[PDB]
Design a protein around this ligand. Sequence first.
Ligand SMILES: CCCCCCCCCCCCCCCCCC(=O)OC[C@H](COP(=O)(O)OCCN)OC(=O)CCCCCCCCCCCCCCCCC
Ligand SMILES: CCCCCCCCCCCCCCCCCCCC
Ligand SMILES: CCCCCCCCCCCCCCCCCCCC
Lengths: 102, 54, 100, 160, 480
Amino acid sequence: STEVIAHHWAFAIFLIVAIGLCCLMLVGGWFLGGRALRLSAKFYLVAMFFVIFDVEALYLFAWSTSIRESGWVGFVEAAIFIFVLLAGLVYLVRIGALDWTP
Amino acid sequence: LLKRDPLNSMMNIPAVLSRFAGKGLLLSENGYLRWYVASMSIGAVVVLALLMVL
Amino acid sequence: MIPLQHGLILAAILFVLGLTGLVIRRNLLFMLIGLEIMINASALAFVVAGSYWGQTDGQVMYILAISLAAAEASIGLALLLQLHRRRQNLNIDSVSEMRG
Amino acid sequence: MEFAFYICGLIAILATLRVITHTNPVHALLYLIISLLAISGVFFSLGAYFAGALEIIVYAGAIMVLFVFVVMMLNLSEIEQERQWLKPQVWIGPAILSAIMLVVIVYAILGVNDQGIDGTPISAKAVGITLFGPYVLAVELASMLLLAGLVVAFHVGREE
Amino acid sequence: MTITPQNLIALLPLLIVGLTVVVVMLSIAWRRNHFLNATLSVIGLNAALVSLWFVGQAGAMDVTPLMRVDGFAMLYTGLVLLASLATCTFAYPWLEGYNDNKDEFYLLVLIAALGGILLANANHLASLFLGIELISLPLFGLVGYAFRQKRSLEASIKYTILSAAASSFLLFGMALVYAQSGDLSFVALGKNLGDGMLNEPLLLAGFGLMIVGLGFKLSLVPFHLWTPDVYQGAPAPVSTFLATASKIAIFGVVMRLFLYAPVGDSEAIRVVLAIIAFASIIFGNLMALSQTNIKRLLGYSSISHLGYLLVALIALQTGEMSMEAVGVYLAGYLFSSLGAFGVVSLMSSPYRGPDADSLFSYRGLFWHRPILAAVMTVMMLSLAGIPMTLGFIGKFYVLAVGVQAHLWWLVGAVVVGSAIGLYYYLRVAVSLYLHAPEQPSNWQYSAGGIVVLISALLVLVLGVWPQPLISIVRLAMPLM
Ligand SMILES: CCCCCCCCCCCCCCCCCC(=O)OC[C@H](COP(=O)(O)OCCN)OC(=O)CCCCCCCCCCCCCCCCC
Ligand SMILES: CCCCCCCCCCCCCCCCCCCC
Ligand SMILES: CCCCCCCCCCCCCCCCCCCC
C-alpha cells in the first residue's frame, strides 16, 4: 500500500537522519577547536538473574497480547507459570542471592 | 618343535589383536575438550556423508 | 518470494562458522561465544522453516531455543568464572587431566 | 524486503567471521551484537516480528549483556601474546572440516521443494495463542528449565 | 487443543514432580534442612511412582499436540523415577560429608527426573528437545556439584560444552526436518513423501544431525569420547543418574521417534545406525580392556550396552518384539548399573573433601565389605551377559531380535564384544575377591545398602525367572 510504504520511508529517513545527526555532531566536535581489580561475583549473579527473569518476562509478553483469545485455562496456565516464577524469586531472596549486602 | 603348543598361540592371537586395538583406540581419549568437539564434528561429517551417499 | 533455500543456507553458514569458532579457539570464552553462535543459527533456521510454512511453530521453537541459550550461557559463564577463579587462566587445553 | 534480508544476512555472516577470528574479547562481543542485530533484521524481513523483537530484547539485550559483564569481570592475559588460532597449522584442518560439512548441508538444502517465503507478518498474538494452546507443557517445563539454569548458575557462580 | 481433567490425570507424574520441585524450593527458602528436603524429594518421587497406577487406569491417549501417554511412557517413567529415587538414596550419605549447600542437589535431581518423564511421554519434536535440555542442564549442575574439586569442575566444563554443541546440532536437525515436513509431530516426519521417495535429502540431513545430538546423549561412537571423563569426574550418585536415567529416557524417546516416524524405515538411516551400533559395541568393549579405574570402565560399559540397545532398535520395523527386547534389556541394565554405581557411591561416601582423592580401590573388598562385594560381583556378572542374571536375559533378547531381522554383522559384533566384556568384568570380580594390603553408621547408608541389595536380588531372581519382567514389559505396549 501507499500508506505503509510512506511509513516505511518515514522510519528509514528517521533512522538515517538520526545516525547522520549524531555522526555529524561527533565529526564537528573532532574537527572544530584547536588542540594543545577483582570484582565481586554479585555483578554476575544479578546479570544472570536479569537474563533468566527476562526470558520468563518474554513468555509473559507473549501471553499478555492474547489473554482474551486464550480464555480462563490460559489464565490458569499463566498463573502456574507466574507462581513458579515467584517461588523462584522467593527462593532467591531467602538464600541471600538477591542481598547485595552481606 | 611342538612343545611350545603353536595352536594355542595361534588361537591366542585374537587376544593380542584385541589388546593392540584397545591401546590404539585409547589414544582418542586424550582428555582434550577441543578434540572432543572436533571428533563430534568429524562424526557429524561422516554421518551426513553416509546418509547422502545411501 | 524469498527462497527457503537461501534462509537455510544462511543459517547453515552461521552454524558452521560457530562450530569453527568453537573448535579452533582454546579460550573458553570464545568457545562459549561459538556455542551461542551455533544455537542462534539453529534458532534462525527454525524461524526460517516456520516462516516458510506460515506457522507460529518456528517462533515457538525459537522461544524454546533462546530459553535454552540463555540458561546454558548462564551455566557456562558461571563455570568460566570458577575456572578463572581457581586456575587464573582460560586455556581449555590446560584442563585435560583425566584421559585414557 | 528481499534486499533487507540479503544485506542483513551478509552483515551477519561477515560479523560472525570477524567474531571467530578476533583477539579482543570486547571487540568480538561487539561484532557478535552486530550479528545478532543483523539476524534480527533477517527475522523482521521474514515476517517473524516477535522473533526479531526477542532477538534484540533477549539475545542482544540480556545474554550478550551477561557476556559483556563477565568479560569486564575478567579484565582481559597470554591471549594476544600467543595468536595460535591464526597460524595455519591450527585452523586449516577445522576450516576444511567445516567447509566439507557446509558443502554437504548445502547440497542437502538445494534438493528441497521451495515455494518461497511470502513474508506474511506473524504477530505475537498468534504466537501467544499457540504458546498457551498446543504448547502448554512447553511453557511450563521451559519455566522449569530456566529455574534449573538459575539454580545451577547460582550454585556454581558464587565466591564464598 | 484444550486440556480435560482426564488429561491432568494422565499427566500425574509430571504435575507431582513439578509440585515437588516447587515444594522443595519453598522448603529451602524457609530453612535449609538437608533431611527434610531429601525426604520431600523422595516423597514426591514415590508419589509420582504410585500415581503411575492412576495413569494406567486412565488409559493411553494423546495429552497435548505434544504428549502421548501409553504403557511405553508408563514403563519409561517408572524406570526414570526408580533411577532418580536411587540417585537420591545414594546421594544423601555422599552429601552428608559435603560442606557447601546440600539441598540444591535434590532440586536438580527432581528437575532432571521431570525431563526424563517429559522424554518418556514425548510425541513431538518440541517435547523431545525440551526433555533433552531438561535432563542435561540439571546434569550440568550435578556433574560439577563439587566444583571445588578439580576433576568435577573439569567434567562439568566438558559436559556443558559438548552437550551445548550436541543440543545445537540436534536443534539444527529438527530445523531442517521441520523445513522439509512442515510438522513437528513424530507421526508426520516424512508423511508427505511418497512413491518410494522416503530418502529426501534435507530430511535425511536433519535426521543425521539429530542422530549426532542423540548419539552424544547415548554415548554412541563417535560421539562417545566424553563418557569416561564425565563419568569419572562427576560425583558417584551423579554418575549413577547419568548412567541410568538419562540413557534410559533418551533411548526411550529415540525408540518412539523411530517407531512413529515413517522415515524411521529408511534404508540409509538403518545402515548408519548399524555402523554406529557396530562401532559402539566394538569400541566400548575394546577401550575397557585396560581400565584400572572403575568409573571409566563403567563408561565404556555404557557405550557397549547402548550399542546393544541400538542393535535392538535397528530391528524395530522388522520384528514386533523389538520394543519387548528394549524394555527387558533396559530394566536389566538399569538394575545392574544401579547396583554397580551404588557400590561405588557407598564406598565413596561421605564426601571426603575437595582436596582429597576419590579413588575406589576395589581390590580386596570382600574382606571388609562382603555384602557390597557380593552385590558388586553380581552386577559385574550381570553386565557380562552371564546366565542366572537379568543382563543375560536382555542380551538373549538382543540376540533373538538380531537373528530374527538377519542382522548378522551386529550379531557377530555382540558376540565379540561380549567376549571382551567377559574379560574385563571377570577381572573386576576376581580383583574384588583378591587380598588387599591396606584400606556409615547411619540408616541412610543402610538404605543405600538395601537399595543395592534389592537390585542384586532382582538381577538374580529375574535371571533365573524372567517371566514377570516379560509380562510387565508386554503390558507396556504403545499406540499403533
Ligand atoms: C565369532 C563368533 C560370531 C560369528 C558371527 C555371528 C554369526 C554369523 C551368522 C552368519 C549367517 C549368514 C547367513 C547368510 C544367508 C542370509 C540370507 C539367506 O539366504 O538366508 C536364508 C534364510 C532366509 O530365507 P528364508 O526364505 O527364510 O529361508 C528359510 C531357510 N530354511 O535364512 C534363515 O532362514 C536363517 C539363516 C540362519 C543362518 C545361521 C545363523 C547362525 C549360524 C551359527 C553361527 C555362525 C556359524 C558358525 C560360526 C562361524 C565362525 C565364527
Ligand atoms: C594439545 C592437543 C590439541 C588437540 C587439538 C585437536 C584438533 C583436531 C582437529 C581435527 C581436524 C580434522 C581435519 C579434517 C580431517 C579429514 C576429514 C574428516 C575425516 C574424514
Ligand atoms: C552366576 C550368577 C551369580 C551367582 C553368585 C555369584 C557370587 C555372589 C557372591 C557370593 C559369595 C561369595 C563368597 C566368596 C568367598 C571366597 C573365599 C576365598 C578364600 C581364598
